[PDB]
Structures are given as C-alpha cells and as structure tokens.
Write a protein that binds this ligand. Structure first.
Ligand code: SF4
Length: 225
C-alpha cells in the first residue's frame, strides 16, 4: 500500500482505538517525553508508571533534576534496572541546565547531542511533545515496518538499519505526526507482537506482506550466527 495510505490507516485506527492515558502522554512537554522514553527503553510500562510519577513529583523541571545529587537520582531509580540510563539521564539534565538555560532543547541536533539520547529517541521527544516532523525507529516500529515491507535482514546491519530508517521516513507524515508515532509504538507493542501477531486487529493487514504470506517470523531478521 502507498505510504499515504499507510499513515492514513494508522491514524484512523489510532483515533478509534488509541488510548493516551499514560502520565507522559498527558500535558506533554519535551522534559516529560524524554524522561518517559528513557525509563521505557528497557523496562515494562506497568513497572515504569509509578517511577515516572515519583520522578515528576520530586523533579518538576529538568533544572530540579540537574541540581539533585546523583546518588538521590540513582536511589529513586532503584527497581528500574539498567542504571547506565539513570547516569546519562542526570548528565543530560545537567547539560540542559548548563548549555540551554534549563529549557529542554526543542531542536533535533541539541536533543540528539544529549547523553543517553539517540536518533530515534530525539525524534520521539520532539514529535510527541511538539509535533515536530521526525520519524522514529524503536523495536516496535522496526517490527511493524519489517513485516509490512518484508525486510528480512538483521537490523544490526547498517544497510538494513538504513533501509528501515528510510521506510519510517517514507510512511511518517508531518500532519498528525504526534499521533502517528505514538500509534506505531502502540501497534508494535500490542498488535504486531514478536510472537503470533494479531493481524486481524491490525490496520495494516490489508497490505502487509508478512500477513499475506503468514511469514511474520521472518521479519525482522535475527542476528546471524
Ligand atoms: S498485519 Fe500482522 S504482521 Fe503485518 S504489521 Fe499488522 S500485526 Fe504486524
């Protein structure tokens, strides 16, 4: 299906089934989306929710986070795992306070320059909180795109990653980007699951190659070895 149809079908689906109840999806700000993306990186959403709230209550602004002792930040992080994220989070907060006057940057270069923030995360922060025209490519998106467009290579390979980034850019619209990007992550997390995807509940089922061939297990490709 055309890229235009892809985004339209995804947005229509999101309007009907979209659930934006999470704390970081309400009254969004770059700071809140950033904080949530880092916590959600390697931790289940159910587990994250209470921590997000505790962090927002203790650190209303990025400057409050920056000024706090690293040890307190690490203590509040206890239970989320992968503490390297917490250390980069604090450094990023300090960078924002030092280089951007306490105002979380709203430009791609400046956001991506932050420790612990990559290309996809920077795009998610700006698109979700400000509606900036940037695509994302997390585990969820890679799976949906790989299956819909039959990209069987291992994303760990540069050429395959570039291919997926191009597909994401191609289907990602400017109008409604905030809803489209959140929709794609929701689709990849709740519908197009790693195992036995629920294609009958997927807005892309009519044009998805994996669905047509019942070959979802082939996309994305797994690390060769
Ligand atoms: S139709 Fe099935 S395999 Fe294709 S994207 Fe939707 S859930 Fe994933």
């Amino acid at each position: 299906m055309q890229a235009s149809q892809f985004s339209a079908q995804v947005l229509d689906w999101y309007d009907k089934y979209g659930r934006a109840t999470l704390p970081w999806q309400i009254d969004k700000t770059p700071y809140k989306v950033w904080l949530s993306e880092v916590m959600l990186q390697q931790t289940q959403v159910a587990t994250v929710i209470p921590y997000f709230e505790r962090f927002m209550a203790r650190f209303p602004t990025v400057t409050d986070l920056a000024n706090a002792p690293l040890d307190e930040v690490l203590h509040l992080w206890t239970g989320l795992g992968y503490y390297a994220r917490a250390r980069n989070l604090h450094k990023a907060a300090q960078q924002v306070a030092t280089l951007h006057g306490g105002k979380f940057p709203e430009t791609f270069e400046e956001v991506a320059a932050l420790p612990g923030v990559g290309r996809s995360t920077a795009g998610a922060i700006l698109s979700l909180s400000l509606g900036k025209h940037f695509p994302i490519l997390d585990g969820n998106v890679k799976r949906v795109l790989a299956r819909c467009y039959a990209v069987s290579g291992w994303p760990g390979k540069k050429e395959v990653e570039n291919k997926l980034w191009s597909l994401s850019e191609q289907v990602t619209p400017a109008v409604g980007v905030e809803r489209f990007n959140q929709a794609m992550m929701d689709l990849g997390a709740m519908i197009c699951t790693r195992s036995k995807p629920k294609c009958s509940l997927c807005p892309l089922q009519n044009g998805c190659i994996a669905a047509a061939n019942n070959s979802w297990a082939l996309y994305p490709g797994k690390k060769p070895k």
